[PDB]
Amino acid sequence: GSSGSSGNAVNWGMREYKIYPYELLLVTTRGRNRLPKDVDRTRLERHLSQEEFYQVFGMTISEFDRLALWKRNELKKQARLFSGPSSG
C-alpha cells in the first residue's frame, strides 16, 4: 500500500484531540487528575496514541470503535478515561 508517516496528532475529523499520556489522561475523581484543557472527557481515550491507547485498553482504536457501546463505555470507566454525561 501507499506509505506515510504519522505522529503529529490524531488528525481526527470530528475534532482535534491532542496526543496525551494515559497518566494525565486519567479521570481520578479525587486523584488529582492532570487533564489538560484540550481533552475531551468523552473522547479522552482518543487522546491516547495508538501505542498507548492499546497498552491501556488492550486494543487499537479501530477495534475499540467496533466494540459494543457498553464495552466502549465500560472499558474507559475502568481505565479512568470516562466521565459520562451530567446525570443530575
Side-chain angles (χ1 to χ4, degrees), residues 1-60:
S2 65
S3 79
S5 201
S6 183
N8 280 297
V10 293
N11 297 281
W12 269 118
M14 82 286 297
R15 265 149 157 160
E16 199 91 297
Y17 313 129
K18 177 150 170 163
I19 290 305
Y20 287 118
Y22 170 88
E23 26 172 332
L24 82 66
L25 278 190
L26 291 160
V27 72
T28 71
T29 302
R30 48 269 162 70
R32 288 276 293 158
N33 31 25
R34 210 270 200 71
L35 275 166
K37 70 150 207 89
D38 180 67
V39 277
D40 211 329
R41 295 319 202 275
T42 53
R43 310 282 176 175
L44 295 183
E45 74 282 336
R46 289 196 168 156
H47 287 266
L48 275 175
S49 46
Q50 301 191 102
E51 272 274 83
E52 320 271 53
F53 171 96
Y54 182 115
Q55 285 210 100
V56 181
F57 290 83
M59 81 210 89
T60 59

Side-chain angles (χ1 to χ4, degrees), residues 64-76:
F64 177 89
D65 212 90
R66 294 169 81 166
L67 300 178
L69 188 74
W70 70 265
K71 190 65 150 157
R72 298 186 275 167
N73 292 325
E74 167 192 284
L75 297 170
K76 293 169 49 176

